[PDB]
Amino acid sequence: TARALREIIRTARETFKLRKGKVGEPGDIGHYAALLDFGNFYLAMTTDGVGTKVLVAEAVGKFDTIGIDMIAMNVNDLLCVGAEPLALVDYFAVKEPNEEVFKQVAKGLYKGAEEAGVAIVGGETAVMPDLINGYDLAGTAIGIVEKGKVITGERIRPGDSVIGISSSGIHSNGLTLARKLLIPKYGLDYEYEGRKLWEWLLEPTRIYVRPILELINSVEVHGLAHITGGGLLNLKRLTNYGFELEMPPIEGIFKLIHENGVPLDEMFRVFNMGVGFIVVVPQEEKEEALEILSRHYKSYELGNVTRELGKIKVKNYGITL
Amino acid sequence: TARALREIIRTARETFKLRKGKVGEPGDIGHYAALLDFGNFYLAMTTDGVGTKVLVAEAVGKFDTIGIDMIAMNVNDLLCVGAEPLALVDYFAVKEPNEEVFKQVAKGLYKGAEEAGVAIVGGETAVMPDLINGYDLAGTAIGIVEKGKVITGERIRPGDSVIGISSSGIHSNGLTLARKLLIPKYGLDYEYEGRKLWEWLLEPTRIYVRPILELINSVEVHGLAHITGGGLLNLKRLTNYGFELEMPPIEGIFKLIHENGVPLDEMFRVFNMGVGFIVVVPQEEKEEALEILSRHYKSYELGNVTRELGKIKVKNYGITL
Numbered sequence: 180t181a182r183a184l185r186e187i188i189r190t191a192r193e194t195f196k197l198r199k200g201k202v203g204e205p206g207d208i209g210h211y212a213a214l215l216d217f218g219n220f221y222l223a224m225t226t227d228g229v230g231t232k233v234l235v236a237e238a239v240g241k242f243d244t245i246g247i248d249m250i251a252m253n254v255n256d257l258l259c260v261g262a263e264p265l266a267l268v269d270y271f272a273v274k275e276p277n278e279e280v281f282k283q284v285a286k287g288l289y290k291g292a293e294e295a296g297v298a299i300v301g302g303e304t305a306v307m308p309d310l311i312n313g314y315d316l317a318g319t320a321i322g323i324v325e326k327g328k329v330i331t332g333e334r335i336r337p338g339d340s341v342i343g344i345s346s347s348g349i350h351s352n353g354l355t356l357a358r359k360l361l362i363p364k365y366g367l368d369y370e371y372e373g374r375k376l377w378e379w380l381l382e383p384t385r386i387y388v389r390p391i392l393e394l395i396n397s398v399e400v401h402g403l404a405h406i407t408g409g410g411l412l413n414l415k416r417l418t419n420y421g422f423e424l425e426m427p428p429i430e431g432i433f434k435l436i437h438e439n440g441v442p443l444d445e446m447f448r449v450f451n452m453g454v455g456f457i458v459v460v461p462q463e464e465k466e467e468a469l470e471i472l473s474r475h476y477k478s479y480e481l482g483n484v485t486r487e488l489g490k491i492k493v494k495n496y497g498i499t500l
Numbered sequence: 501t502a503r504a505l506r507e508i509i510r511t512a513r514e515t516f517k518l519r520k521g522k523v524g525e526p527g528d529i530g531h532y533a534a535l536l537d538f539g540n541f542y543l544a545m546t547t548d549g550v551g552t553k554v555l556v557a558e559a560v561g562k563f564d565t566i567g568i569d570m571i572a573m574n575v576n577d578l579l580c581v582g583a584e585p586l587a588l589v590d591y592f593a594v595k596e597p598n599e600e601v602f603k604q605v606a607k608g609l610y611k612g613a614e615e616a617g618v619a620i621v622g623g624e625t626a627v628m629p630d631l632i633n634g635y636d637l638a639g640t641a642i643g644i645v646e647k648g649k650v651i652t653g654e655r656i657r658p659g660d661s662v663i664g665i666s667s668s669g670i671h672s673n674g675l676t677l678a679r680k681l682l683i684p685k686y687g688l689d690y691e692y693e694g695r696k697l698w699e700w701l702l703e704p705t706r707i708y709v710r711p712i713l714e715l716i717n718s719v720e721v722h723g724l725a726h727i728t729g730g731g732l733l734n735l736k737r738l739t740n741y742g743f744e745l746e747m748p749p750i751e752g753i754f755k756l757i758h759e760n761g762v763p764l765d766e767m768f769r770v771f772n773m774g775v776g777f778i779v780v781v782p783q784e785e786k787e788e789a790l791e792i793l794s795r796h797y798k799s800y801e802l803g804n805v806t807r808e809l810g811k812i813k814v815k816n817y818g819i820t821l
């Protein structure tokens with residue numbers, strides 16, 4: 180996947196000169212959102228989809244929260260440059276204009292937008308049954324960050340505290356491995372800790388806008404990472420320094436996947452393993468940061484930034500990424 | 501589709517109040533781009549895909565122009581609120597990450613971006629074979645328009661001049677009808693009026709940024725319409741007044757589609773029929789408008805806006821929409 184993308188990223192970088200010295204001049208590609216220079220402030224913009232989570236929603240006739248996943252995926256990324264989310268458009272590529280599916284999608288769109296503080300300002304509906312085997316929901320979000328208040332991770336230093344905010348569950352990454360591994364063996368109706376497998380797989384992605392905007396307005400923040408594709412590897416997008424981490428107990432759907440033979444190092448690169456968002460703050464700000472985040476969701480002191488460049492050591496599981 | 505979309509549109513309008521009085525407060529949904537209030541200017545933002553034209557690219561193995569279709573679909577829509585395109589992200593949802601395909605997609609991306617004057621600032625690559633039967637390429641673009649310079653069509657008045665700019669060909673709408681009607685009977689190698697069927701179907705969408713930016717900076721412009729889905733019906737989005745039009749002769753791929761049994765009333769509602777972009781200007785600007793446009797592409801005085809309401813009379817074809 181990354182080797183195929185090389186040609187597109189290189190070409191994209193060549194277009195940057197088109198907006199040189201002009202409104203909207205961009206930063207580099209590779210971070211959680213693009214930054215566009217509008218003088219006093221940057222506009223941040225990111226585009227992200229839900230993934231094959233939508234195939235579970237279809238089987239049980241419940242798209243009621245898939246719009247939450249879409250909104251969460253986009254606005255949580257905007258947070259990772261320090262931006263306040265403002266607006267979103269949605270791209271709905273569908274096999275058919277199913278009024279039942281669309282009515283369900285609409286319910287979660289409002290719930291998500293209110294929690295994220297964004298207006299849904301437009302969108303695109305593409306009915307292409309020869310191209311789409313289902314209902315693929317994506318979107319694009321923009322937000323604003325003042326010049327001088329971008330948070331890319333360049334301020335991360337060894338000794339910084341690393342704090343994790345609990346995920347609500349599987350979120351929207353790793354669904355293809357989980358679907359292929361569990362559904363044929365167990366059935367979608369398989370009951371695990373009092374909920375059906377489809378409920379574990381469909382649990383809507385958590386939205387972190389309110390705790391993170393409160394955090395960055397109260398304490399000095401050096402890095403912010405939304406845990407999506409790549410798992411804990413997303414931390415290396417913030418800094419060259421290493422991490423020493425104690426990850427929380429493996430529970431819920433992650434335990435079920437693990438007990439079905441996925442190696443532990445693979446799942447910390449694929450699933451969020453209970454931690455959906457990670458923040459990096461100076462050690463002296465650790466307790467206030469935890470107090471702020473713990474108002475909103477269960478949060479963990481995970482560990483510390485080290486001088487072991489490039490390594491992520493999950494000490495309590497004996498895994499090094 | 502419009503029926504299935506009612507609950508999504510209704511719900512999206514209910515989210516507008518989340519940004520009431522804040523940066524990014526939106527205008528209404530329904531137009532070619534969303535308008536976001538940033539004080540002295542609006543940010544315009546739109547999201548659009550290529551459509552099943554990608555199936556033709558995949559069947560023949562030629563992907564080096566669908567990046568042009570994507571960028572054209574998005575930046576041409578930005579023009580229709582009077583905005584200058586600035587930046588675009590691409591959403592590439594694929595069955596497989598083929599490096600040859602991606603290498604070609606990147607050539608067309610660069611050419612579209614340079615002609616449109618936009619930087620490609622990021623994007624998203626979703627590998628989902630259970631959900632995608634090919635290579636679906638879409639994107640989101642943003643532009644800027646100063647307060648007091650928004651061109652919505654509200655200034656359109658009876659008597660105004662209606663000018664059409666030629667398309668390059670089929671552009672990116674109606675491909676589902678053209679593919680299903682023509683390929684099984686003729687094959688993609690069939691020769692028609694000097695070109696193969698696949699060349700008729702894959703001709704890249706024209707980009708109108710340079711002629712339209714010159715036009716709005718030179719003359720008074722009352723409305724701008726990019727001719728996409730719905731064909732000439734897109735004029736009804738600008739105004740409730742009527743139109744009296746003479747459309748150019750039926751040529752090339754539209755002629756072959758017509759000869760294969762699609763009535764002209766349907767094709768003026770599906771295909772651009774030779775006109776890719778329409779502008780409405782007061783009659784005293786008509787000749788200067790034609791001068792400017794004709795320096796970029798073949799353009800036509802199509803007709804006038806009428807005091808009569810709601811109808812689009814294509815006079816020389818005896819058709820009323």
Ligand SMILES: Nc1ncnc2c1ncn2[C@@H]1O[C@H](COP(=O)(O)OP(=O)(O)O)[C@@H](O)[C@H]1O
Nearest residue numbers: 187191208209210211407590592622623624625
């Ligand atoms: N098709 C694409 N076109 C342009 N840039 C892309 C594309 N896919 C990914 N990128 C860029 O590569 C980086 C990694 O993106 P991704 O792997 O989706 O992670 P994330 O969503 O967390 O940024 C991002 O900065 C993104 O903008």
Ligand SMILES: Nc1ncnc2c1ncn2[C@@H]1O[C@H](COP(=O)(O)OP(=O)(O)O)[C@@H](O)[C@H]1O
Nearest residue numbers: 269271301302303304508512529530531532728
């Ligand atoms: N899935 C969606 N969610 C929100 N708004 C949508 C969606 N699909 C279409 N719209 C809105 O409907 C209007 C028409 O959309 P569309 O038919 O794609 O035409 P266009 O690209 O010419 O605006 C646009 O204002 C768009 O923002």
Ligand SMILES: [Mg+2]
Nearest residue numbers: 227252256407
């Ligand atoms: Mg993302």
Ligand SMILES: [Mg+2]
Nearest residue numbers: 302303547548
């Ligand atoms: Mg559209």
Ligand SMILES: [Mg+2]
Nearest residue numbers: 548573577728
């Ligand atoms: Mg469009």
Ligand SMILES: [Mg+2]
Nearest residue numbers: 226227623624
């Ligand atoms: Mg992404």
